[PDB]
Every structure is written in C-alpha cells, then in structure tokens.
Design a protein around this ligand. Sequence first.
Ligand code: NI
Length: 341
Amino acid sequence: TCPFYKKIPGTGFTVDAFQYGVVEGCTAYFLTHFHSDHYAGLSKHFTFPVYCSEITGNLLKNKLHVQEQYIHPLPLDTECIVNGVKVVLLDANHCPGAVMILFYLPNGTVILHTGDFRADPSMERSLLADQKVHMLYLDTTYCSPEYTFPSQQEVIRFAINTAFEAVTLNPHALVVCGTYSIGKEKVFLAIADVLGSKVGMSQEKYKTLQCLNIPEINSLITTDMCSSLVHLLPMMQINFKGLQSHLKKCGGKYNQILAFRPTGWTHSNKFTRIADVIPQTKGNISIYGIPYSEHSSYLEMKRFVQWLKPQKIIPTVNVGTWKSRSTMEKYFREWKLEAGY
Ligand code: NI
C-alpha cells in the first residue's frame, strides 16, 4: 500500500507514488524527477493528472509515451494553483529537471518535499527564505557522518586533468564513461570539451539527452561512434571484460582505454583525498571510480536543516529498518539542540 511519507496531509496529493495502482482519494500525482525508483508505474495507459517540471514532462512524453493531456508541466520559482492549493517548484540540484515542492496548505501549514536533492547554500536565497516551513519531507540518503565527499567542481577538475594528460601522452587512447540514468552529464561533457571531441552514444541515450534543454547540446553529443573519442556505455559494461570487448569493436582505432565510473559514495572517502585517487588497471585498461554525488553529504544536509529550522522532519530514504530510523532521529535531535530551535 502507499506509504504515509508519500502523502501530503490536508490535500488529495501524493509524491512519487506511481506503483500502488489507484491511490484512494488522490486528485493529483506529483513526480519530483525522472529516476526509475520514483516514476515506477507510469506509462501511456496512465489517466490521472501528473504535475512535474518541463524537463520531466519531456521525458514522460518521449520515453514513457505518457499522453500529453495528462502531463501538467509547471515553471520553476513561480506560485501556481493546483486543485485549489498554492504550490511552488524549486531547483533540487539533483539530476536534470529534478525539483523540490513547497505546498501552502489552506489551514496555514507550509510543507517542503525535497524529492532527491544535493543541499546547497544557494537554496538559502530562493523563495524558501520568505516564509516559515513547518514540515520537511527529507532526502536522507547519506544521513550519517561517515558520508563526506568533495565538491562536484573538484571532482570534475580531477577528471578533466586525468583525461587530458592521458590522451596527450597517447593520442590512440579511448575514454569511456558509464551511465544508467539521467544525471552526472557534467562528467562526460567536460571531458569531451577538453579533448575537442563529441560524446558518442546509443540512439536510446541520445534521445534521452535531447529531452533535457541543455544549451548547445547538438554541438556536444552524437550517435556516430566512429567520429568520437569519448564513448558512453551502460554502467554494467564498465569492467575489464566489458571494456576489452568494446575495444575489439573499435577496429584497431585505439590501443588503450581510460574509463570513469561516477559512483555515489565509496569507503575509500573516509581515508582518501580526491588528489590521491588511483585506478584499477589490467593490461591496457584503467578504471577510475570517482565520488561525483548528486545527493547531500551529511554536513550539507545538516547545514540546510539547521538553516530551515523545521518543526517536524519526515525521512523519505533509509526508512525500511528500525536501526536506520532510530539513528536518523538521533541526528535530527542533535541538530535541533545544537542550533536552538
Ligand atoms: Ni534520484
């Protein structure tokens, strides 16, 4: 059945609740972003109103074939009325088209649902600064102090310099980058830009990227693999077996692969600095795991919440075990006592 943390009190609304069949009493289904654990259940046969960003609405239409009449895209940073309730969509700093949603309940309560987010100080100067929030439905993916990671900028710097050095040393090296969903486009696009190459990919993946309103995208990507020295492949193929195989397909155009796996967190982060990251190498193939996150670190999440000072927090991630739930609630209380709200 639909869990309580996907329901917005005092409304007929749900968030990211498409796999439960018809939710009893739901008048509008919100979708925060186009990732499969969140859209699971949508298709051309869906006949209820879906509210989302413009980019998420491009993907619903083009990838899932949802009929246009049921897609209700909303502009960001704009007060809108949905079934008599005022809402605003904010940028979530997650993947393309990902939003947070602010609901202004008729009784005066204000609720923020973060969807999936990477908290940032820039959020402290959006429409959130302008009124008090009573309840926060919080992306708690990495809500434990062991989860530290570098800025996105530092990670992209590392990847750009690594790729540039390798290819200038060996002009016959191929760069490969793994992907399994939208998000993290900066990794492969920044590498292609420093090398003066387009990124080559499957027709399915080119179609997905063409829905994202990225500027000058026709200049950066292509389906002609032959003309490209940055290839994108499914994340599952980013291993020695899958990479040797791909190298065989390139017809002796290349004699070395340098591959990037943009993971979330990995426990090399407790010890290792970004400066100190090394590949796993087998023969003429090297694989780098880089900690490019599109979710809040523990410290980034803590700062956002101590700034917002919500009256009640409802976690949306890691809610399936009592030890996780209990540990999260302990951090919430610490933050509150330290900050004084
Ligand atoms: Ni996500």
